[PDB]
Design a binder for this molecule. Structure first.
Ligand SMILES: [Ca+2]
Ligand SMILES: [Cl-]
Ligand SMILES: [Cl-]
Ligand SMILES: [Cl-]
Ligand SMILES: [Cl-]
Ligand SMILES: [Co+2]
Ligand SMILES: [Co+2]
Ligand SMILES: [Co+2]
Ligand SMILES: [Co+2]
Lengths: 353, 355, 359, 359
């Protein structure tokens, strides 16, 4: 019921950066630079611009001081300058509020379009960006926990099929999803760049930003982040993991920044660039779907997420999911999960694993 | 309370092997050989003798068919044949039951002494053992989850200070322990070979065997064991982990064999061979003591453990711990743990960490 | 001098598979299945079809028994069935010999076009392929040296700029290259799928196939391949490495199969999918350009490569390189290389790095 | 030829530290601290005291400014204060020169004995040492290339059996060695702490110090050291490696400090603490004995090593090896090596492996 525009979709290359509003810039800096080791592309007293080890565009993350912590923009790079015009015509046809700035919203981005998308998320589309030193061989700077690329976003929205069709029309291809036999969709993963995803939809009250994910080269780099957080006596900011995912097959960790923005560290998913890439559907009751090793998913992972802003910088009103809750059907009083389909041995009932 | 003998202690080198009684030899073989990739030194219809990738002695694990799953013997190798005579005299002086066989209790071990020790555990001391092909460079056999050495045992016993003193007289050096501010000791780790431990004491009803631990080379080898168990749809046999330990600083995993015998996979602890190796004491309420990342310890890890047999093959009676329970004081209804000492933020009241 | 056709280029997704002719199918099976752990999708007395751990198309490697070991086809998957028609019209405009088979040349591929390309290489274009079980979570099968994807081909050709221009018109984008200060190009890397490359051109007498490359997840997986070859006492089949590449930044190893076909194992290069991805040009005398740690490149790496076949199955005639030789200008008696540009300290004159001369 | 004393040998725990004389303290600091990431326990204008990630004694490496770069002392820790007295009586009975300092030779060491041992090496024995913060869980400091322990020394001496017997009488057990079928020993490895070695003897002119070795946790840590040296454009200081050893089975790398002192990075050898630990003998012509993958050993590895000092601080005179040279018999012009014993295929005659010859 989000209508497909007659205007052609912009050609989206990949997720590129997120602008997060933070309440204490210095404490956010400590987390993203001193703990996590992201690289400074620019900073002043209002903003810090950060990039990953292998990036050549200006930044992957912008931290902006503001009164209420929230996602301000999730940005996708498009293939040509003309694609920003296409994005503008496309969202205007969808009836969405748009704002175009020929010189960008943040430093190091040129001509850019921000929109309040049909799911209430602040999307940005741009092509032009200031190139910086690509640090991919700067092993003199490489951290034991080095974050090497921006991998994806993950959005909480109440109606997953409705959002999925809209992103499919935008050219995103679904690689994996979670469903049940009654026909409810709980989550979907979709891509442009030929990894498992550039964004994903998690069923829940929204719009809220569930997480931003960075990749590492190897699994030991993720381990090191946990080990460092232990040494810094901030292990209470490790929310979930480390683990192996079922969906995506990636090794992963979820941690919480000082404003409780959730960051995923992620590595070693698989190639999805062929247009007939096989789509994998998991049953919501399969206890290996989210953590392959069957470790339980903490309730906060399902219930907590970041606010998102509209184009005026005000928090978007939240719409409550009416479809079945993944939390309730798996770990709630009436929920259940299995290790082996149809086997009570290794099943969990009204209880997590 | 357990007196120090006048007789000299045997010079113990290291933990060497465990004999575990198992109820179904085929299912146990499938776990230890097919799932975990241990190497068969010998087998027949009653027993399977298994060794790790870098071992040269006959075995690190003997699976013996029997009617009740249990630990039958935890064996330590001693430095010389005369040390087996010393062990016998030492345990005689302690008034323990002993049994000595010049040709061994299990295949590939020679002159051996088994004892019912003062804590009710079946200990074996031996020197003589049949050498086998050391597979340490057999990369044609190397598994992505390869188990490379036997590292330690861990014993459940009701009174940790009492056991600790006895193990110290026997020559084990305590490297780390867990205590509280009220005089209670909850666990201790102690060594002969220059790693964090060869055995360890966990406070609880006992004697029971908490686990046997094998090492891997690298952390990714432990991750692969988890990944393989997922692919085999036996992830319900992963009990706890993977994680980083606080105590020992080792990367770890606990899994359960077909008879619920607990196996730890362990890697990358530190050198303890100097005699003034600094001893580390953790507070029982420190939520980074067991898992450094603050992940919760499932109650089964505290409550479940394997039976142990006496020298007649009968199960040892269980004596209940009267000291405070590590489970109850940390994750029970009146339990408590902290992330930072004295900080309410990141503390847990009456429940386990991580929500 | 290869002109840009008026006909549209086919939309190529990625490299997909190679067909290698092998002389002893059993010995080749031992290497690829028993030593390297590739997964069999089909086999019989004549061919063995193999795939990597994360693949869903039918195969990444076909071993075909034949009298003369050679590359028979390097295959690229195209985006749609109609792109096979575009490939056909494109190479016909180029004046190249083509052959179309609606039911494929090898099992598990459908409608396919093979061509003798302007550099003399047998390229295949196809869309249709038989899907197989994607083994990406089959950790019960996973080996300590697991090969997880097909990454690229590497082609030996005498005139690199000529070939580079042709591949650019086909839609490949150059990511890295090696040149000198007086305008000679020694090598170029170029991509479709958003890694450093799907194919690459190495200056030398050609056409010859330099190597086929497979990926691993981690660097330790590459180390294990070496360790296993030592245990199997075939360490003489380790040609070069393991190392860190300069060009591509990937961890690597080169090994030789029973017919001397060269296989590279490769991991952890970077993303190139943005259309203004910065190109990187290295100086040929930079001793960190091929091995970042400065380890010497063995001369066989420069001189030895596989024969390639035409569409009749006959060996393509070799044409000699007339531009300067990378081997000669870096490690030959009149060559040189440097660690730091302009610094005599850490420079090597008339010999390779680390203290060896050429055998 | 070196008699076993009647006096009892001191009980040696392990290698503990080396004192190296360096010519430019700031340049040496840049290598050991900025490049390699060792942790500073103390420094002033004359010395730098350094320790590894998991150490609790004061240091593993003392860098001492002086006019001539050299090993000044290889230090072993003993089990008790009374073992220092035993060391003094033991070496006095061997007829060696000894010097005892109740408050140490270097800061953070207490009562210490230095000796000119029968092979001309400056050994120190001590028990007392200042404990420092053990940084084994300080993951806030941990480097991608972190050196976690001091593992061993390696000594160049002309007569290996002569030195091996003396070290055996001192309590070291030989774990592996290299010999040929004609009675020559080329190298021996020997331990106290239950790893492959605490010291080792390499046949050549001596006394000279071949290297000091530090361990890492994982193989990727050694890879990162290489990668960092590339990024710092000091790849010319990577001498040999990275590799898998045959002898010791450890993953390894050799690098060269500013005064050319050789440092090995090392990981994942095996347990040797049992008294009947099987002793492994490799043949000197086995091309997998030093590098398991068959990579050639550069001539500098055989010919270059650090000077060692006597107790007066003067350089020890070098005695020439008369036994056969490992270089000459393996990679020399009349050399030979094999991949598979008894197989001509994969054998090397008068040259090194993998296409190289002596520079
Ligand atoms: Ca001979
Ligand atoms: Cl998940
Ligand atoms: Cl624990
Ligand atoms: Cl290269
Ligand atoms: Cl060596
Ligand atoms: Co995610
Ligand atoms: Co344990
Ligand atoms: Co290549
Ligand atoms: Co060494």
């Amino acid at each position: 019921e989000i209508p497909k525009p007659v205007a052609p979709a912009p050609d989206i290359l990949r997720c590129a950066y997120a602008e997060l509003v933070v309440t204490d810039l210095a404490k956010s800096r400590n987390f993203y630079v001193d703990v996590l080791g992201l690289h400074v592309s620019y900073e002043d007293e209002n903003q810090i611009y950060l990039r990953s080890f292998e990036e050549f565009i200006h930044h992957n993350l912008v931290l902006t001081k503001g009164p209420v912590a929230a996602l301000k923009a999730m940005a996708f790079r498009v293939r040509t300058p003309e694609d920003v015009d296409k994005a503008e015509a496309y969202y205007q046809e969808l009836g969405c509020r748009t704002e175009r700035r020929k010189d960008g919203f943040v430093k190091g981005i040129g001509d850019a379009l921000r929109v309040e998308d049909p799911l209430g998320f602040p999307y940005e589309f741009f092509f032009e960006t200031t190139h910086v030193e690509r640090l991919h061989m700067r092993y003199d700077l490489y951290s034991a926990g080095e974050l090497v690329r921006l991998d994806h976003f993950n959005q909480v929205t109440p109606d997953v099929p409705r959002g999925r069709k809209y992103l499919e029309d935008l050219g995103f291809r679904v690689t994996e999803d979670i469903q049940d036999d009654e026909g409810t969709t709980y989550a979907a993963w979709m891509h442009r760049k030929g990894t498992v995803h550039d964004t994903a939809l998690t069923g829940g009250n929204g719009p809220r930003l569930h997480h931003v994910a960075f990749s590492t080269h190897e699994k030991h780099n993720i381990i090191q982040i946990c080990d460092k957080m232990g040494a810094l006596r901030i292990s209470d900011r490790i929310e979930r993991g480390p683990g192996r995912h079922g969906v995506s097959n990636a090794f992963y960790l979820y941690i919480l920044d000082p404003d409780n923005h959730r960051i995923e560290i992620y590595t070693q998913d698989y190639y999805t660039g062929d247009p007939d890439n096989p789509t994998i559907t998991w049953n919501v009751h399969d206890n290996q779907r989210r953590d392959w090793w069957g470790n339980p998913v903490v309730p906060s992972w399902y219930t907590e997420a970041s606010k998102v802003l509209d184009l005026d910088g005000n928090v978007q009103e939240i719409i409550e999911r009416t479809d079945d809750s993944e939390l309730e059907v798996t770990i709630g009083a009436d929920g259940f999960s299995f290790t082996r389909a149809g086997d009570e041995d290794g099943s969990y009932h009204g209880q997590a694993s």
